[PDB]
Amino acid sequence: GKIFVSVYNIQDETGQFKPYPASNFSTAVPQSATAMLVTALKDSRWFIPLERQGLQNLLNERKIIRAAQENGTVAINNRIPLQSLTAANIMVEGSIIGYESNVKSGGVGARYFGIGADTQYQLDQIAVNLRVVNVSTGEILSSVNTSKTILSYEVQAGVFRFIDYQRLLEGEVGYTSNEPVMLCLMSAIETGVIFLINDGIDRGLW
Amino acid sequence: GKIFVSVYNIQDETGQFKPYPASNFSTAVPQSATAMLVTALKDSRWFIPLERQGLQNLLNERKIIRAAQENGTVAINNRIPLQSLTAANIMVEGSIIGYESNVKSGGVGARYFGIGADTQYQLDQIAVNLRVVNVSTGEILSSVNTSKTILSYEVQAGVFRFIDYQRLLEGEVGYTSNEPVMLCLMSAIETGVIFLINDGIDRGLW
Amino acid sequence: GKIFVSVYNIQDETGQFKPYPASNFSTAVPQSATAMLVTALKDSRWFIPLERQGLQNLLNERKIIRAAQENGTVAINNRIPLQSLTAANIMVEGSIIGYESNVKSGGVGARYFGIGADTQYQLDQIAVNLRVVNVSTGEILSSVNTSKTILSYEVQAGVFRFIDYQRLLEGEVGYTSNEPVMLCLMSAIETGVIFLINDGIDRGLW
Amino acid sequence: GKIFVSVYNIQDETGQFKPYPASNFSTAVPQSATAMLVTALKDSRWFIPLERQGLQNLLNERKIIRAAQENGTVAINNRIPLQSLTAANIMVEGSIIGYESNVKSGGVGARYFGIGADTQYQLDQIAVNLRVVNVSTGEILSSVNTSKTILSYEVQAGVFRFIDYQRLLEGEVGYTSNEPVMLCLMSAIETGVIFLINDGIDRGLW
Amino acid sequence: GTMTFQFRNPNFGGNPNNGAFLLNSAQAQNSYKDPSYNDD
Amino acid sequence: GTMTFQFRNPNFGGNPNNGAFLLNSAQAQNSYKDPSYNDD
Amino acid sequence: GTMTFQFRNPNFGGNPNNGAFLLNSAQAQNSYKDPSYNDD
């Protein structure tokens, strides 16, 4: 049997925004946890998430349903039987508790006569806290802080020497790969979910 | 038979804005999901969307209708029979859970004596989460995270050498193509909708 | 026996934001205390935290539970017995009372003919105040101000001399490590929690 | 016997923010008085502070306590006897009434052939006003304005001369120490608290 | 942080202040002489 | 404060105003003469 | 105000406009002559 879990809001409590050249309002971490976390809890075959984020939309839709068939005039084929809003035994709250930019930068670049090549790397770090709280009493059953590094590297190479008396050969090839902060945040949430499931296994619950 | 689906709001939870030179308030992802998603659900022949975004405008229009013909004085030709606000069996919530700028940049450029040519490319990545929730009980039936890369490339070439003793020939031809983030977001929503339909097929529903 | 502790809000009262090149809205200290502090109190085997941050989400979830099983029609297997919101004997309030940027900067760099190397370091300092208040009477039982330095260093080296008559060898290797302000804030909160536990031990309580 | 003191809010009335390169929203003085002041009153063995900053959190926690044990069903071991919110005889209000940047700057730097060295210093000044008001009648019993200078100095030295015909020796060593404005504000609050205690001693009270 | 690939050559890649160096550092290593003088 | 690793060479690392120095400070220490003149 | 330690040399410490001076003020004090000319 699966456990009903109600994820209400996984707030972006990192408070960080992206530096120049990015916008001043461009937050460094997606505001979209409670969608990555519901996906992580759904993907793990242990939990059935309940919406609870868009609960007001669900309540207005149920208002419309209950008002459309309250006269018994709707066709018995396309009527929707509302039972009740399914209740959750536990509740997974949490936050994105931090995003430190460039916890570890670095780079080596060499260049002999004309031809040269370099490499750079930057590690950001995103930390996500997840708390399984027991809805019956309110106490926090489990609380895990997970971290994940975000590696953004860049490898370049270039030639700017003379080939003949007056024939200049310039040229260069580069490549740059940033790990998407959304994928790293999803990985941190995934590891936190596995930790919560294993912890609930290791003490009584689940 | 088609399924009534009520799309309320597909929120732009990426939190990212466009970098310089673009405005600081210029969001990187359109705020116009719940219009691309209703179009995607309408185009797939499985669903009948209900408005639910502009539901207040629909309710005021129905107020005006019910107030215009409540006296029986409107002509029997141009009277509008209001039945009831059609109820939705499921509800497709979601978000644009992320937009990472330049997940993979790169470029190769060569230039011999005078004549040269280069190429650049940048891959942005947009991720969209879609959740079919069951309106009866409130549990999330399906949840899919879809991704889509946005390739913006630029190919240039240029000549700046001397043709004669003192005759300088400068010249250059370029081209630059950015995939519209609206079309890539629509493609991500489309793939997510196909995934939701196939998932509902693969387990009981639909 | 463990003590029920209710952490409501550990506010970011430092008021500082990050300097250029970072965004103007990018706060220097994470807004995510009350998640690091609940984790610190949970990790120390002395306390059972209660949520109290997201208490409204817990109250709406309990509303949904109490409304789902108030008719006795829910299955006796998946019904959730609500007892009462567990009460806390003490309450750990607090703040991040300060973040001074570069309390101590410095750096030594030497460079002989061509080859050179340098080092920089900067110490930020984050101070966190934690107050165990007695919920019965309201008086502050314990109040501790903890500090933690955040060392960000950078070591570089570079060669720019000529190897032959007209063969220029440029090259350089660098490294840069910033301590994540989230980890240093978590360490300050940890030391403050150990201080609070030892203080409660040293006078009557606990 | 100790005096119950209720510190409500020690507001940052300096109105100053930090200059470039710091953020525009980065206030020059921590917003965290009423936490440094409660710590200063607790450390001096004369006062018992009451929370009064987070009083709403305390009142909701007492609501939860009084609602958890109002049915007599809580275990007689883990029930919390609420007596009453302890009342304060006096009340220490105040403000951070000023922060002048660079009340006294200066610096001497010499540099002979190649080798040189310099020193800079800047004195900021923070002034804190503390007012012991009598809660019975409302009149201000004591009012003290304390000042504290914040010395930020920087000592550098550097060599940029030639050692041989064509061997250039560059090099330099620096150091920079800013007094943390949080520690200087805590020292100003400390001196103000000692002044208030001695003043209450010198006329009747305490 | 986000790393963006930027060309270093002012040709094909914009940054023009990087030119006077790239050339003066390529002439400072030009070991090729005129095929007229110092030759046959 | 946050320290970011930035290359000093205008090649591989952007900062172009750092070039005219790096070269003029490498020619001011160029003790290598032409293998034609002042040689065999 | 907050004082931050910044290197003055464009090598190891960024500020590149400080280079053309540091070198021209080190050549204006270069009292070392070529060990070939004005020597043995």
Residue numbers in the entry:
A (entry chain E), B (entry chain B), C (entry chain H), D (entry chain F): 47 to 252
E (entry chain e), F (entry chain h), G (entry chain f): 20 to 59
Q: What does the primary publication say about this deposited structure?
A:
Curli are functional amyloids that play critical roles in biofilm formation and adhesion in many Enterobacteriaceae. Two outer membrane proteins, CsgG and CsgF, form the core apparatus for secretion and assembly of the curli structural subunits. In this work, we show that CsgF forms a stable complex with CsgG via a 1:1 stoichiometry by lining the extracellularly faced lumen of the nonameric CsgG channel via its N-terminal 27 residues, creating a secretion channel with 2 constriction regions for curli subunit secretion. The free C-terminal domain of CsgF recruits and binds the secreted nucleator CsgB, creating a growth point for further addition of CsgA subunits.
To improve the resolution of the cryo-EM structure of the CsgG-CsgF complex in order to accurately locate side chains of 9 Asn36 residues of CsgF that consist of the upper constriction region of the CsgG-CsgF channel, the purified CsgG-CsgF complex was proteolytically digested with chymotrypsin to remove flexible regions of the CsgG-CsgF complex that may affect the stability of the complex in the detergent-containing buffers and increase particle heterogeneity on the grid. The resulted protein sample (denoted as the CsgG-CsgF20–59 complex) contained a variant of CsgG that includes residues 47–252 in complex with the most N-terminal 40 residues of the mature CsgF (CsgF20–59), as confirmed by mass spectrometric analysis. In contrast to the oligomerization state exhibited on size exclusion chromatography, the CsgG-CsgF20–59 complexes tended to form filaments with varied lengths on the cryo-EM grids. Intriguingly, there exist 2 types of non-physiological inter-complex interactions: a head-to-head homodimeric interaction and a head-to-tail heterodimeric interaction within the filaments. Using a similar cryo-EM structure determination approach we obtained 2 maps for the nonameric CsgG-CsgF20–53 complex and the nonameric CsgG-CsgF20–59 complex, with an overall resolution of 2.9 Å and 3.2 Å, respectively (S4C, S4D). The structure of the nonameric CsgG-CsgF20–59 complex was obtained from an interacting mode in the filaments through which the most C-terminal 6 residues of each CsgF20–59 fragment interact with the periplasmic regions of each CsgG, stabilizing the conformation of the 6-residue loop of CsgF20–59 in the structure but with relatively weak densities. Structural analysis indicated that formation of the filaments of the CsgG-CsgF20–59 complex on the grids during cryo-EM sample preparation may result from 2 types of inter-complex charge-charge interactions. To test this, we found that increased salt concentrations in the sample buffer significantly decreased the lengths of the filaments formed on the grids.
